[PDB]
Enzyme design. Structure first.
Site, mmCIF file in Angstrom:
data_model
loop_
_atom_site.group_PDB
_atom_site.id
_atom_site.type_symbol
_atom_site.label_atom_id
_atom_site.label_comp_id
_atom_site.label_asym_id
_atom_site.label_seq_id
_atom_site.Cartn_x
_atom_site.Cartn_y
_atom_site.Cartn_z
ATOM 1 N N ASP A 1 72.703 72.820 85.451
ATOM 2 C CA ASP A 1 71.403 72.781 86.113
ATOM 3 C C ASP A 1 70.326 72.234 85.186
ATOM 4 O O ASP A 1 69.196 72.720 85.201
ATOM 5 C CB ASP A 1 71.074 74.207 86.616
ATOM 6 C CG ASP A 1 70.087 74.360 87.761
ATOM 7 O OD1 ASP A 1 69.720 73.335 88.375
ATOM 8 O OD2 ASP A 1 69.697 75.521 88.061
ATOM 9 N N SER B 1 64.496 86.776 91.265
ATOM 10 C CA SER B 1 63.084 86.563 90.909
ATOM 11 C C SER B 1 62.780 86.802 89.427
ATOM 12 O O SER B 1 63.510 87.518 88.751
ATOM 13 C CB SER B 1 62.169 87.412 91.786
ATOM 14 O OG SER B 1 62.212 88.778 91.421
ATOM 15 N N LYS C 1 64.028 88.986 84.651
ATOM 16 C CA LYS C 1 64.801 88.381 85.742
ATOM 17 C C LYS C 1 65.593 89.462 86.456
ATOM 18 O O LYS C 1 66.210 90.295 85.799
ATOM 19 C CB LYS C 1 65.747 87.273 85.227
ATOM 20 C CG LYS C 1 66.270 86.378 86.339
ATOM 21 C CD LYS C 1 67.165 85.284 85.793
ATOM 22 C CE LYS C 1 67.906 84.570 86.891
ATOM 23 N NZ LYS C 1 68.538 83.320 86.400
ATOM 24 N N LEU D 1 56.328 85.300 88.316
ATOM 25 C CA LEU D 1 56.408 83.964 87.701
ATOM 26 C C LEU D 1 57.098 82.951 88.655
ATOM 27 O O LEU D 1 56.781 81.768 88.645
ATOM 28 C CB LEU D 1 57.067 84.007 86.305
ATOM 29 C CG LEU D 1 56.337 84.826 85.213
ATOM 30 C CD1 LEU D 1 57.239 85.007 83.973
ATOM 31 C CD2 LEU D 1 54.953 84.208 84.859
ATOM 32 N N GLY D 2 57.990 83.441 89.496
ATOM 33 C CA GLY D 2 58.682 82.641 90.504
ATOM 34 C C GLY D 2 59.977 83.237 91.016
ATOM 35 O O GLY D 2 60.610 84.032 90.323
HETATM 36 C C1 LMM Z 1 53.578 79.553 85.501
HETATM 37 C C2 LMM Z 1 54.302 80.052 84.283
HETATM 38 C C3 LMM Z 1 53.640 80.311 83.118
HETATM 39 S S1 LMM Z 1 54.622 81.014 81.895
HETATM 40 C C4 LMM Z 1 56.014 80.958 82.920
HETATM 41 C C5 LMM Z 1 57.351 81.402 82.712
HETATM 42 N N1 LMM Z 1 57.715 81.979 81.480
HETATM 43 C C6 LMM Z 1 58.961 82.474 81.130
HETATM 44 C C7 LMM Z 1 60.131 82.530 81.820
HETATM 45 N N2 LMM Z 1 61.045 83.128 81.003
HETATM 46 C C8 LMM Z 1 62.447 83.391 81.337
HETATM 47 C C9 LMM Z 1 60.379 83.432 79.808
HETATM 48 N N3 LMM Z 1 59.130 83.039 79.904
HETATM 49 N N4 LMM Z 1 58.249 81.292 83.702
HETATM 50 C C10 LMM Z 1 57.862 80.754 84.874
HETATM 51 N N5 LMM Z 1 58.767 80.737 85.874
HETATM 52 C C11 LMM Z 1 60.163 81.197 85.795
HETATM 53 C C12 LMM Z 1 60.767 81.209 87.197
HETATM 54 C C13 LMM Z 1 61.044 80.255 84.906
HETATM 55 N N6 LMM Z 1 62.082 80.821 84.272
HETATM 56 C C14 LMM Z 1 62.852 79.986 83.560
HETATM 57 C C15 LMM Z 1 62.559 78.596 83.519
HETATM 58 F F1 LMM Z 1 63.349 77.703 82.868
HETATM 59 C C16 LMM Z 1 61.435 78.133 84.194
HETATM 60 N N7 LMM Z 1 60.662 78.969 84.898
HETATM 61 N N8 LMM Z 1 56.641 80.283 85.168
HETATM 62 C C17 LMM Z 1 55.737 80.411 84.184
#
Ligand code: LMM
Length: 274
Positions: free
Chosen positions: A124, A15, A35, A12-13
């Site tokens: 943040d 990590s 996470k 998701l990003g």
């Molecule tokens: C492209 C996408 C589609 S769904 C989703 C998601 N979902 C998510 C993150 N968490 C903690 C629970 N659900 N989190 C993320 N990225 C993570 C890094 C994230 N975590 C927390 C946040 F506030 C924002 N983003 N991207 C997506």
């Protein structure tokens, strides 16, 4: 939660990964967000357990739900399918009107007002840290920089998100509800820019400081700009009453900044008069 039942779906990003927690191997298991720490050090780990304790202690509609833990420590959370508000706004801007932006705004305040009762300081607040559950609900999705206020003090002292920071956070490393209010004003600004790339807080502040300024100099010049009452401009189409809320959140006088209670009420009134 057992590591052997967490099936990898996608990145998701530390990590964040999307997993399926399927103990009885059959894909019936639920999709969760996981996470973990990338460069796991004793200091990086100790703050991650405090983050896990902070999330577990939070029970609110506009705060990402804690599900459990997994031990090489992994924080298991509910999965919110539409991603960050920062991405969702860029993607679906066509179906997002000012009433919708104010519905999201209100929810962010409510979640922030709740954090305040736990004496927690987010540090943040940015649209990138807000997740979209569905078209009608958003949640604060990350608590990585969140601090607990000392029992006897109204503030806390600590790569930082400088363009979201209050002047005293930049000059004295002082974080409080009032500095979270300051950042909420930047979040409100982001929303009303619809994340138009050129209009972001880093892009705008850099133009005001001079795009020539580099590294260590940027912070001093930003501190000076804020001291000389330089502020982010009013976004195009932003209602003046909404911009007045932003400018009030951006008061150099920490005690003159509004409360999340008053902000939610003011936003709810504007929304109803819309
Ligand atoms: C492209 C996408 C589609 S769904 C989703 C998601 N979902 C998510 C993150 N968490 C903690 C629970 N659900 N989190 C993320 N990225 C993570 C890094 C994230 N975590 C927390 C946040 F506030 C924002 N983003 N991207 C997506």
């Amino acid at each position: 939660f057992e590591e052997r039942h967490l099936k990898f779906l996608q990145q998701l990003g530390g990590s964040v990964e999307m997993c399926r927690y399927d103990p009885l191997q059959d894909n019936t298991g639920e999709v969760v967000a996981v996470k973990k720490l990338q460069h796991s050090t004793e200091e990086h780990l100790r703050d991650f357990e405090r983050e896990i304790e902070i999330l577990k202690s939070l029970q609110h509609d506009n705060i990402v739900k804690y599900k459990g833990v997994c031990y090489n420590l992994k924080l298991i959370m509910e999965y919110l399918p539409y991603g960050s508000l920062r991405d969702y706004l860029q993607a679906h801007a066509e179906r997002i009107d000012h009433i919708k932006l104010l519905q999201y705004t209100s929810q962010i305040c409510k979640g922030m007002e709740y954090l305040g009762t736990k004496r927690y300081i987010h540090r943040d607040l940015a649209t990138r840290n807000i997740l979209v559950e569905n078209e009608n609900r958003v949640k604060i999705g990350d608590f990585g920089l969140t601090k607990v206020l000392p029992q006897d003090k109204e503030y806390y002292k600590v790569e930082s998100p400088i363009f979201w920071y209050a002047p005293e956070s930049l000059t004295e490393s002082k974080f409080s509800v009032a500095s979270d209010v300051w950042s909420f004003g930047v979040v409100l600004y982001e929303l009303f820019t619809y994340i138009e790339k050129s209009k972001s807080p880093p892009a705008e502040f850099m133009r005001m400081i001079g795009n020539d300024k580099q590294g260590q100099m940027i912070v001093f010049h930003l501190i000076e700009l804020l001291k000389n009452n330089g502020r982010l401009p009013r976004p195009d189409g932003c209602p003046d009453e909404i911009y007045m809320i932003m400018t009030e959140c951006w008061n150099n006088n920490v005690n003159q900044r509004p409360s999340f209670r008053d902000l939610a009420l003011r936003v709810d009134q504007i929304r109803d008069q819309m």
